[PDB]
Amino acid sequence: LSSNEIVHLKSGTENMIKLGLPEQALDLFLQNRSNFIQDLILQIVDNP
Amino acid sequence: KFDETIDGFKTLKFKLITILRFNIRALCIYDIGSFFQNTKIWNMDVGSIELDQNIASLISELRRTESKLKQQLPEKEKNSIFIGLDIVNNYALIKGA
Amino acid sequence: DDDFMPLSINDKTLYEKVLKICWLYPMTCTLAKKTYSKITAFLSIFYRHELHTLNNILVKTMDDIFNDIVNKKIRSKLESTSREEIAQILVNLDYFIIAAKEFSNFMTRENILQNPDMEIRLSSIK
């Protein structure tokens, strides 16, 4: 829930699968890309 | 415990009060982009396109300010402080403007 | 550069290149079109100073850096009291005043293109 990169995200994602908590894992991942895109919108209407 | 939770309520109204004053004074600050807007013209300056950049800054940090304020705190207070202070200071901002 | 004469009609090789220069008389509009097109062409030093308020008042800095704000043309041409192409060189400055209108027509400008509502420049053209 903190890294803007890919490698830890990729890695600990498949480590979370390696625990076998994949559904929670995917949901957190999608939440990270949600927050990601969310904050990517924070760079700027100037004109439509 | 009523003096206690009373005082915590007083800190709540003080704090949310301070946030609403912060956003509102950010606006009234931001209207001074008109001061000066470099001689808002006489009868024309045609053209006359756009767009008084300080006001775009006001839209910008207003927008991000509401972004992070929607991130941290709860919804109802944000709608409250932002709603009342924003619309009212918009109106009187035009008035003294 | 001198011998203020009309444009020699070579008939016809660089006449299309003269038409790009037109965006006659010998040299002033003929070379100065390449000068200013070279200038604002060179003044596109952005596409890497973008994601900030460079789109703000630095645009007005580009406004002050006009077709070098035309007194640089309009001192020496203002100074040159010479009967050779007198007002015929300035027919390429009434016609380079039509290139001043081309410069205020060189107006799909910046902020990337916003607000497309005015881009006029005609102070030094006046």
Swiss-Prot record, chain A:
Involved in the secretory pathway as part of the exocyst complex which tethers secretory vesicles to the sites of exocytosis. Plays a role in both the assembly of the exocyst and the polarization of this complex to specific sites of the plasma membrane for exocytosis and to the budding site. Also involved in assembly of the spliceosome. This is Exocyst complex component EXO84. Belongs to the EXO84 family. The chain holds residues 604 to 653 of 753 of the full protein. It is found in: Cytoplasmic vesicle, Secretory vesicle; Bud; Bud neck. It comes from the Eukaryota. It comes from Saccharomyces cerevisiae (strain ATCC 204508 / S288c). Component of the exocyst complex composed of SEC3, SEC5, SEC6, SEC8, SEC10, SEC15, EXO70 and EXO84. Also interacts with SNP1.
UniProtKB/Swiss-Prot annotation, chain B:
It is found in: Cytoplasm; Cell membrane. Component of the exocyst complex involved in the docking of exocytic vesicles with fusion sites on the plasma membrane. The exocyst complex is composed of SEC3, SEC5, SEC6, SEC8, SEC10, SEC15, EXO70 and EXO84. Belongs to the SEC8 family. It comes from Saccharomyces cerevisiae (strain ATCC 204508 / S288c) (Baker's yeast). This is Exocyst complex component SEC8. The chain holds residues 824 to 920 of 1065 of the full protein. It comes from the Eukaryota.
UniProtKB/Swiss-Prot annotation, chain C:
It is found in: Cytoplasm; Cell membrane. Component of the exocyst complex involved in the docking of exocytic vesicles with fusion sites on the plasma membrane. The exocyst complex is composed of SEC3, SEC5, SEC6, SEC8, SEC10, SEC15, EXO70 and EXO84. Interacts with SEC4. Belongs to the SEC15 family. Present with 4280 molecules/cell in log phase SD medium. This is Exocyst complex component SEC15. It comes from Saccharomyces cerevisiae (strain ATCC 204508 / S288c). The gene is SEC15.
